Amino acid sequence: KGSDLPELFSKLGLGKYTDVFQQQEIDLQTFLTLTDQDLKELGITTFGAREKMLLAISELNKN
């Protein structure tokens, strides 16, 4: 569920980005479609953060 994103970010060590995604109105179905370029436009400027998010998205879509 979309309400699970903050907990997800927290365990990924990405809790610092939770506020930007809420302010940018990103819901679960949008989140699951994001690419590296989308994350860059969202302000995620370090590779390690973007890649962790993309791999997380990939796992959520696989399961």
Side-chain angles (χ1 to χ4, degrees), residues 2-4 6 8-10 12-63:
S3 64
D4 291 320
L8 176 58
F9 281 12
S10 175
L12 297 175
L14 301 174
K16 154 205 287 188
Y17 299 101
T18 290
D19 276 307
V20 71
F21 279 71
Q22 297 184 337
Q23 289 187 349
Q24 289 303 107
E25 299 180 353
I26 295 165
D27 59 23
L28 181 62
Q29 289 296 80
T30 299
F31 178 75
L32 296 180
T33 69
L34 295 176
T35 66
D36 184 80
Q37 189 61 31
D38 295 327
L39 300 179
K40 287 187 172 188
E41 285 179 344
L42 285 165
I44 322 302
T45 60
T46 71
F47 171 80
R50 289 197 305 282
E51 186 89 329
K52 291 177 176 296
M53 303 183 284
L54 287 169
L55 292 171
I57 290 165
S58 173
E59 289 307 293
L60 291 172
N61 284 327
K62 173 199 193 184
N63 294 339

